[PDB]
Amino acid sequence: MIEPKEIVDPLTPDASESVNNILKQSGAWSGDDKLQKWVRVYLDRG
Amino acid sequence: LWIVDLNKSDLERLGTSWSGSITIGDKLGVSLNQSSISTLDGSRFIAAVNALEEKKQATVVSRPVLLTQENVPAIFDNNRTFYTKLIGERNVALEHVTYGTMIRVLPRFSADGQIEMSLDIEDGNDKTPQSDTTTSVDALPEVGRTLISTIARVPHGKSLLVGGYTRDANTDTVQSIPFLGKLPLIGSLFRYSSKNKSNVVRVFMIEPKEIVDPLTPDASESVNNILKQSGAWSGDDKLQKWVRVYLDRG
Amino acid sequence: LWIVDLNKSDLERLGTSWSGSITIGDKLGVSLNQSSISTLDGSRFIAAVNALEEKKQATVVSRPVLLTQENVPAIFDNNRTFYTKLIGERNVALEHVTYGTMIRVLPRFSADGQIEMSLDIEDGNDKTPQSDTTTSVDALPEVGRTLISTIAR
Amino acid sequence: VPHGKSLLVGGYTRDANTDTVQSIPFLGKLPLIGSLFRYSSKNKSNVVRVF
Amino acid sequence: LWIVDLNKSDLERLGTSWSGSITIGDKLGVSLNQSSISTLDGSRFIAAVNA
């Protein structure tokens, strides 16, 4: 079966906001690390 | 680029299954649920019992980041090469396969401030067959890949869903002996029942943004805090400071 | 694109089947429902009994999603490659087969607001023969595919 | 880049968390004997590479 | 050019897993969580423990 549709708006909530809820729930989150926060602060700027 | 991958599973087996042969007084023999009887003539009845109850869960979130300019093609690549020895005589060669994450993008600003991109995404890994059989030592890395080629246009700071894949499944079997499987307290030794369930989700998301400022704090300042915290710092050495004073001038 | 796959089954065997040989006083022998008697001369009668009653059910729902623009061909691909070692001498090569889900679409808006598409769908998987025989260790992945090529609006 | 400043060119992160639980269906729920039949594993990783 | 690479991990296994064969009076045999019984007919039950 085929079901097409037209996209006019971006994702809500953002792609970087739904991932931070997956990592906190599954327990794989490491944004609170003392050693890795010196470099992950560049990538998670937004 | 975000690559989110989730899994879930369930499994339960409980029951027996009778299959064997017998020999009754070297003049007549009785088989049960078999095809070959002669090579299993000296054996006996087998009551294979199964009991298991399994749960599972797995999340993987991977993210490559790449920086480029307007109208300039860029490549990020993180691969793995597998070399094999084709023992010929004439055109002897080292043949190789390659698999891994790979992005090739060509960004461009529109008139409104949105960013249009021409994407070529590949995300592959190595699928493993059973390790106990002989085909794990030869040149058989079963590779599974995932290719996406499209064109999307996102505003500055927002995001779009480019690809995706879901899969749901549920199987269940029930076996029994026709009359003995309905006994009240003895009939549990003859039935059999299995189940299965899985839920897989993979998505690909794109989030571009515009860079106008350099890093703050500097790249040589965030590294000196990593080396001091992890204990790998050697800028206080008596012997290596005569040469490391040229490189760490700033 | 939705790919729905359902199954159902039923099975019941119940009964015996007699097939064997005998030797009566080293001067006459009696066979029963056989063709070869000489290589089964030292054996006996066999009463193969079968008893089974099986039910089954299986559902699979798979769904690939792809995003593109007007008049732009796009590809989604989720495959699996099987490498084999053809031990030749001259044109030695790694030969490979490939199977998996694959969509190639070319969307286009009509004048009324409907979306016409030019589809090329492939959905394949790996069929498995009996594991106990020797042909499970060589390069025999029996592949079954499903190809569809059409135009819909 | 300006003179003396810096820029982030590449990058890669990866996070993972798996956990399995196996048991025997009835013997795995005994109070003091049922520990000899269960099984449980875990895993976690966090990788960061930058250029 | 700076190339920074960090890692982290965690792992814990605890439990048993029963898989073996038996022979009861040379007329009937019982397997448990196996596929091949004939080449493991002279063996016993195995309780693989992990910690």
From Swiss-Prot, chain A:
Effects seen without this gene: Insertion mutants are hypoinvasive in the HEp-2 cell assay.
Subcellular location: Cell outer membrane
Lineage top rank: taxon: Bacteria
Residue ranges crossing the lipid bilayer per the database entry: none
UniProt record similarity statement: Belongs to the bacterial secretin family. T3SS SctC subfamily.
Function according to Swiss-Prot or TrEMBL: Component of the type III secretion system (T3SS), also called injectisome, which is used to inject bacterial effector proteins into eukaryotic host cells. Forms a ring-shaped multimeric structure with an apparent central pore in the outer membrane.
Subunit description: The core secretion machinery of the T3SS is composed of approximately 20 different proteins, including cytoplasmic components, a base, an export apparatus and a needle. This subunit is part of the base, which anchors the injectisome in the bacterial cell envelope. Forms a stable homooligomeric complex. The complex is composed of 15 subunits.
Name assigned to this protein: SPI-1 type 3 secretion system secretin
Residues of the full protein shown: 512 to 557 of 562
